[PDB]
């Protein structure tokens, strides 16, 4: 068995096993005896005949494919996939392409030597499409089509087509750098432009020269995918017509209830017909309050159905049942229906360029997102979309939503590229490259929070910091509070800082707005206002009805919709905190323990006041003063800590709390710069003794500290004794 003949045999063999055998075939060149080589060549081909039989078995157990708008494009798409490594398929609303493309690949013969990876944004979209495909081909669970939504779960050996989330294939990179488990990869819903989808598209661009066998298919909505085609070396684009019957759009812009409009929108829709209605909701605690209000309103033949990604398998599959009635689905942004109610708002992750924080504001959604919510009404009958905002409001919205890469803190970006083993940020083929100027600043903060080391790799603290959905500065304050029994007060302020201040101030009532907000103010901290209020709101929420409480936000000048968001984020955090195994206290923590935990995320934000009683000195010789109307504006203490710094007329320090200088050193060990001076000898102590200064970013946390310099630096001690 000549070496070339057994290497030609590897072409007819599965992907991972080709690499192992070819390396062992080269291990036979180092063998000496001629006939001993030919013998071990023979036993290797018996394993190769075994592995080549696993290919034949997979090819003979292939199911026959049956196609029920995309079917006209089938021959077009089939031939384009055949003669191109990268092809793009954009289709609207109909979503017929999502289930049909994996079969098209199978009809080429792909699923045999490697799986057919298909990527979806969340876990629910993976299983349903896998199931819908499995029905169509008349296969049973455990056959040629499976899925995976947890990194622990493995697919069956028979599985030819694999559905998964975007974060699952990213998590598979480290173990399989070349992604040899698959021979086809389909990235679906790519128009969402999340980090995971942007990470996956760039990595595949790197992986293409190493994989002359792989075939890539990027599929999304009609959100112009020429960008995807340009990212690869000018890939083909195929546009299947959605062919939904046109939708009617009514612009109905908004005692005065934000929920009232949804009641009146239900009234208008029911008058036309009784078709199933889909109401888009931002947040899941708002879903429950709207759901209870619609059920307590008591309608005829009504079913209010609240959808969550945190629902059970049984619960979630109820939306896909046959109902035989009317059902009102109040779903989050995860999304037969005839009608749609669209308030036009959603929670988006935006980085604040003026306060240098990453927050999660509620924003007027773009035109392309509103058009996707519109296209939910796709049926033989004309559907109806009701937008709860004007027609100016819609056309005063941007056409598209900025990619997540372009609105995320680069610290969080890198923190996931290193958690994923993606390499250096500047050397990654981005579809949208972030600004290079802030790459270095991002690393400085990750180092400021001890999130990284240099082997690039990340601290075990950075593993915990990759998990939390808040800002690294805020996420670090969380992880510290574990050591001080204030994980509660940490998560309160951490969430409260991740959103716009719910305490409102209208021009009409400013004295009253301040009078009522003033009840929850601490004499020494602007982070204890959030904790005091959150406690008060909890007592009112436990003694008041949803209407008595929601109306209380009006009388306390509070943004009810942001109060719910504060609780949504608090719970999405505590979900991760418990995923990491971190306890949470039930007793109140003391001023020190909570502000030491705030300090480890606000180290670049420490200030020392001058004897002027006015201005402050900060990191890198920064000069600031505290925002007017902070709790400490009239009694400015010697050392403060500010949640954020922003320049207007000058650099101001917003959200501040007083600290002790002594607290800063035991946490600044990674950043202290300690210098000494005035070395001399003492008789009773009996050693050279200097005085030590310690700085943080130039700040004298320690000014005059007598040290035992002989125990510190003995070498330079003698070399100053000769002088």
PDB file of N, CA, C and O in Angstrom, residues 119-158:
ATOM      1  N   UNK A 119     -27.374  28.197  12.451  1.00  0.00           N
ATOM      2  CA  UNK A 119     -27.267  29.066  13.616  1.00  0.00           C
ATOM      3  C   UNK A 119     -28.507  29.944  13.742  1.00  0.00           C
ATOM      4  O   UNK A 119     -28.966  30.522  12.752  1.00  0.00           O
ATOM      5  N   UNK A 120     -29.049  30.034  14.954  1.00  0.00           N
ATOM      6  CA  UNK A 120     -30.202  30.858  15.277  1.00  0.00           C
ATOM      7  C   UNK A 120     -29.886  31.761  16.462  1.00  0.00           C
ATOM      8  O   UNK A 120     -28.993  31.458  17.260  1.00  0.00           O
ATOM      9  N   UNK A 121     -30.597  32.883  16.608  1.00  0.00           N
ATOM     10  CA  UNK A 121     -30.250  33.835  17.674  1.00  0.00           C
ATOM     11  C   UNK A 121     -30.519  33.331  19.083  1.00  0.00           C
ATOM     12  O   UNK A 121     -29.662  33.484  19.957  1.00  0.00           O
ATOM     13  N   UNK A 122     -31.690  32.755  19.334  1.00  0.00           N
ATOM     14  CA  UNK A 122     -32.048  32.269  20.665  1.00  0.00           C
ATOM     15  C   UNK A 122     -32.371  30.775  20.610  1.00  0.00           C
ATOM     16  O   UNK A 122     -32.375  30.154  19.544  1.00  0.00           O
ATOM     17  N   UNK A 123     -32.644  30.198  21.786  1.00  0.00           N
ATOM     18  CA  UNK A 123     -32.818  28.750  21.875  1.00  0.00           C
ATOM     19  C   UNK A 123     -34.135  28.289  21.263  1.00  0.00           C
ATOM     20  O   UNK A 123     -34.204  27.186  20.707  1.00  0.00           O
ATOM     21  N   UNK A 124     -35.185  29.110  21.357  1.00  0.00           N
ATOM     22  CA  UNK A 124     -36.498  28.682  20.884  1.00  0.00           C
ATOM     23  C   UNK A 124     -36.532  28.564  19.365  1.00  0.00           C
ATOM     24  O   UNK A 124     -37.135  27.629  18.824  1.00  0.00           O
ATOM     25  N   UNK A 125     -35.884  29.497  18.661  1.00  0.00           N
ATOM     26  CA  UNK A 125     -35.842  29.447  17.205  1.00  0.00           C
ATOM     27  C   UNK A 125     -35.084  28.232  16.687  1.00  0.00           C
ATOM     28  O   UNK A 125     -35.291  27.826  15.539  1.00  0.00           O
ATOM     29  N   UNK A 126     -34.216  27.641  17.503  1.00  0.00           N
ATOM     30  CA  UNK A 126     -33.455  26.490  17.039  1.00  0.00           C
ATOM     31  C   UNK A 126     -34.302  25.224  17.061  1.00  0.00           C
ATOM     32  O   UNK A 126     -34.324  24.464  16.086  1.00  0.00           O
ATOM     33  N   UNK A 127     -35.011  24.988  18.164  1.00  0.00           N
ATOM     34  CA  UNK A 127     -35.753  23.742  18.311  1.00  0.00           C
ATOM     35  C   UNK A 127     -36.930  23.684  17.347  1.00  0.00           C
ATOM     36  O   UNK A 127     -37.155  22.660  16.690  1.00  0.00           O
ATOM     37  N   UNK A 128     -37.684  24.782  17.238  1.00  0.00           N
ATOM     38  CA  UNK A 128     -38.885  24.778  16.408  1.00  0.00           C
ATOM     39  C   UNK A 128     -38.541  24.536  14.943  1.00  0.00           C
ATOM     40  O   UNK A 128     -39.184  23.723  14.269  1.00  0.00           O
ATOM     41  N   UNK A 129     -37.512  25.218  14.435  1.00  0.00           N
ATOM     42  CA  UNK A 129     -37.096  24.986  13.056  1.00  0.00           C
ATOM     43  C   UNK A 129     -36.595  23.559  12.883  1.00  0.00           C
ATOM     44  O   UNK A 129     -36.916  22.890  11.894  1.00  0.00           O
ATOM     45  N   UNK A 130     -35.805  23.067  13.842  1.00  0.00           N
ATOM     46  CA  UNK A 130     -35.363  21.676  13.795  1.00  0.00           C
ATOM     47  C   UNK A 130     -36.555  20.731  13.766  1.00  0.00           C
ATOM     48  O   UNK A 130     -36.601  19.791  12.963  1.00  0.00           O
ATOM     49  N   UNK A 131     -37.538  20.978  14.632  1.00  0.00           N
ATOM     50  CA  UNK A 131     -38.740  20.153  14.656  1.00  0.00           C
ATOM     51  C   UNK A 131     -39.523  20.283  13.354  1.00  0.00           C
ATOM     52  O   UNK A 131     -39.948  19.277  12.775  1.00  0.00           O
ATOM     53  N   UNK A 132     -39.708  21.516  12.868  1.00  0.00           N
ATOM     54  CA  UNK A 132     -40.462  21.730  11.635  1.00  0.00           C
ATOM     55  C   UNK A 132     -39.804  21.037  10.453  1.00  0.00           C
ATOM     56  O   UNK A 132     -40.490  20.458   9.601  1.00  0.00           O
ATOM     57  N   UNK A 133     -38.473  21.089  10.384  1.00  0.00           N
ATOM     58  CA  UNK A 133     -37.740  20.335   9.371  1.00  0.00           C
ATOM     59  C   UNK A 133     -37.921  18.835   9.584  1.00  0.00           C
ATOM     60  O   UNK A 133     -38.133  18.080   8.626  1.00  0.00           O
ATOM     61  N   UNK A 134     -37.851  18.385  10.844  1.00  0.00           N
ATOM     62  CA  UNK A 134     -37.934  16.957  11.145  1.00  0.00           C
ATOM     63  C   UNK A 134     -39.278  16.375  10.728  1.00  0.00           C
ATOM     64  O   UNK A 134     -39.342  15.268  10.180  1.00  0.00           O
ATOM     65  N   UNK A 135     -40.366  17.097  10.994  1.00  0.00           N
ATOM     66  CA  UNK A 135     -41.671  16.674  10.501  1.00  0.00           C
ATOM     67  C   UNK A 135     -41.668  16.548   8.983  1.00  0.00           C
ATOM     68  O   UNK A 135     -42.061  15.511   8.435  1.00  0.00           O
ATOM     69  N   UNK A 136     -41.206  17.595   8.289  1.00  0.00           N
ATOM     70  CA  UNK A 136     -41.305  17.655   6.831  1.00  0.00           C
ATOM     71  C   UNK A 136     -40.648  16.450   6.162  1.00  0.00           C
ATOM     72  O   UNK A 136     -41.162  15.923   5.167  1.00  0.00           O
ATOM     73  N   UNK A 137     -39.516  15.997   6.698  1.00  0.00           N
ATOM     74  CA  UNK A 137     -38.787  14.845   6.184  1.00  0.00           C
ATOM     75  C   UNK A 137     -39.243  13.537   6.808  1.00  0.00           C
ATOM     76  O   UNK A 137     -38.654  12.488   6.519  1.00  0.00           O
ATOM     77  N   UNK A 138     -40.260  13.581   7.664  1.00  0.00           N
ATOM     78  CA  UNK A 138     -40.784  12.398   8.334  1.00  0.00           C
ATOM     79  C   UNK A 138     -39.685  11.669   9.102  1.00  0.00           C
ATOM     80  O   UNK A 138     -39.482  10.462   8.958  1.00  0.00           O
ATOM     81  N   UNK A 139     -38.966  12.423   9.928  1.00  0.00           N
ATOM     82  CA  UNK A 139     -37.949  11.872  10.809  1.00  0.00           C
ATOM     83  C   UNK A 139     -38.361  12.079  12.261  1.00  0.00           C
ATOM     84  O   UNK A 139     -39.054  13.043  12.599  1.00  0.00           O
ATOM     85  N   UNK A 140     -37.928  11.165  13.113  1.00  0.00           N
ATOM     86  CA  UNK A 140     -38.268  11.188  14.524  1.00  0.00           C
ATOM     87  C   UNK A 140     -37.090  11.693  15.355  1.00  0.00           C
ATOM     88  O   UNK A 140     -35.931  11.547  14.950  1.00  0.00           O
ATOM     89  N   UNK A 141     -37.370  12.297  16.512  1.00  0.00           N
ATOM     90  CA  UNK A 141     -36.295  12.832  17.359  1.00  0.00           C
ATOM     91  C   UNK A 141     -35.220  11.795  17.640  1.00  0.00           C
ATOM     92  O   UNK A 141     -35.505  10.675  18.068  1.00  0.00           O
ATOM     93  N   UNK A 142     -33.974  12.183  17.396  1.00  0.00           N
ATOM     94  CA  UNK A 142     -32.867  11.256  17.404  1.00  0.00           C
ATOM     95  C   UNK A 142     -32.432  10.784  16.037  1.00  0.00           C
ATOM     96  O   UNK A 142     -31.666   9.818  15.947  1.00  0.00           O
ATOM     97  N   UNK A 143     -32.896  11.428  14.973  1.00  0.00           N
ATOM     98  CA  UNK A 143     -32.524  11.036  13.632  1.00  0.00           C
ATOM     99  C   UNK A 143     -31.676  12.072  12.922  1.00  0.00           C
ATOM    100  O   UNK A 143     -30.930  12.824  13.557  1.00  0.00           O
ATOM    101  N   UNK A 144     -31.817  12.136  11.595  1.00  0.00           N
ATOM    102  CA  UNK A 144     -30.916  12.925  10.763  1.00  0.00           C
ATOM    103  C   UNK A 144     -30.945  14.409  11.090  1.00  0.00           C
ATOM    104  O   UNK A 144     -30.034  15.134  10.674  1.00  0.00           O
ATOM    105  N   UNK A 145     -31.954  14.878  11.821  1.00  0.00           N
ATOM    106  CA  UNK A 145     -32.049  16.276  12.218  1.00  0.00           C
ATOM    107  C   UNK A 145     -32.200  16.336  13.725  1.00  0.00           C
ATOM    108  O   UNK A 145     -33.194  15.856  14.284  1.00  0.00           O
ATOM    109  N   UNK A 146     -31.205  16.928  14.382  1.00  0.00           N
ATOM    110  CA  UNK A 146     -31.291  17.268  15.777  1.00  0.00           C
ATOM    111  C   UNK A 146     -30.918  18.745  15.993  1.00  0.00           C
ATOM    112  O   UNK A 146     -30.782  19.503  15.033  1.00  0.00           O
ATOM    113  N   UNK A 147     -30.776  19.090  17.265  1.00  0.00           N
ATOM    114  CA  UNK A 147     -30.453  20.462  17.650  1.00  0.00           C
ATOM    115  C   UNK A 147     -29.624  20.418  18.930  1.00  0.00           C
ATOM    116  O   UNK A 147     -29.388  19.350  19.508  1.00  0.00           O
ATOM    117  N   UNK A 148     -29.183  21.596  19.371  1.00  0.00           N
ATOM    118  CA  UNK A 148     -28.382  21.743  20.582  1.00  0.00           C
ATOM    119  C   UNK A 148     -28.541  23.174  21.066  1.00  0.00           C
ATOM    120  O   UNK A 148     -28.219  24.110  20.330  1.00  0.00           O
ATOM    121  N   UNK A 149     -29.039  23.348  22.288  1.00  0.00           N
ATOM    122  CA  UNK A 149     -29.232  24.669  22.871  1.00  0.00           C
ATOM    123  C   UNK A 149     -28.457  24.849  24.166  1.00  0.00           C
ATOM    124  O   UNK A 149     -28.442  25.956  24.724  1.00  0.00           O
ATOM    125  N   UNK A 150     -27.813  23.788  24.658  1.00  0.00           N
ATOM    126  CA  UNK A 150     -26.924  23.824  25.810  1.00  0.00           C
ATOM    127  C   UNK A 150     -25.594  23.197  25.429  1.00  0.00           C
ATOM    128  O   UNK A 150     -25.548  22.217  24.676  1.00  0.00           O
ATOM    129  N   UNK A 151     -24.513  23.760  25.965  1.00  0.00           N
ATOM    130  CA  UNK A 151     -23.192  23.264  25.610  1.00  0.00           C
ATOM    131  C   UNK A 151     -22.963  21.853  26.131  1.00  0.00           C
ATOM    132  O   UNK A 151     -22.086  21.148  25.623  1.00  0.00           O
ATOM    133  N   UNK A 152     -23.752  21.416  27.116  1.00  0.00           N
ATOM    134  CA  UNK A 152     -23.614  20.056  27.629  1.00  0.00           C
ATOM    135  C   UNK A 152     -24.219  19.040  26.671  1.00  0.00           C
ATOM    136  O   UNK A 152     -23.670  17.948  26.489  1.00  0.00           O
ATOM    137  N   UNK A 153     -25.356  19.379  26.066  1.00  0.00           N
ATOM    138  CA  UNK A 153     -26.040  18.469  25.160  1.00  0.00           C
ATOM    139  C   UNK A 153     -25.174  18.161  23.946  1.00  0.00           C
ATOM    140  O   UNK A 153     -24.464  19.029  23.430  1.00  0.00           O
ATOM    141  N   UNK A 154     -25.237  16.912  23.491  1.00  0.00           N
ATOM    142  CA  UNK A 154     -24.574  16.473  22.274  1.00  0.00           C
ATOM    143  C   UNK A 154     -25.616  15.954  21.295  1.00  0.00           C
ATOM    144  O   UNK A 154     -26.676  15.462  21.695  1.00  0.00           O
ATOM    145  N   UNK A 155     -25.315  16.071  20.005  1.00  0.00           N
ATOM    146  CA  UNK A 155     -26.237  15.581  18.988  1.00  0.00           C
ATOM    147  C   UNK A 155     -26.005  14.091  18.749  1.00  0.00           C
ATOM    148  O   UNK A 155     -24.954  13.529  19.074  1.00  0.00           O
ATOM    149  N   UNK A 156     -27.020  13.442  18.184  1.00  0.00           N
ATOM    150  CA  UNK A 156     -26.917  12.031  17.856  1.00  0.00           C
ATOM    151  C   UNK A 156     -25.898  11.825  16.742  1.00  0.00           C
ATOM    152  O   UNK A 156     -25.587  12.739  15.971  1.00  0.00           O
ATOM    153  N   UNK A 157     -25.366  10.603  16.666  1.00  0.00           N
ATOM    154  CA  UNK A 157     -24.412  10.296  15.607  1.00  0.00           C
ATOM    155  C   UNK A 157     -25.077  10.309  14.239  1.00  0.00           C
ATOM    156  O   UNK A 157     -24.410  10.572  13.232  1.00  0.00           O
ATOM    157  N   UNK A 158     -26.387  10.043  14.186  1.00  0.00           N
ATOM    158  CA  UNK A 158     -27.133  10.056  12.931  1.00  0.00           C
ATOM    159  C   UNK A 158     -27.435  11.463  12.436  1.00  0.00           C
ATOM    160  O   UNK A 158     -27.695  11.640  11.241  1.00  0.00           O
TER     161      UNK A 158
END
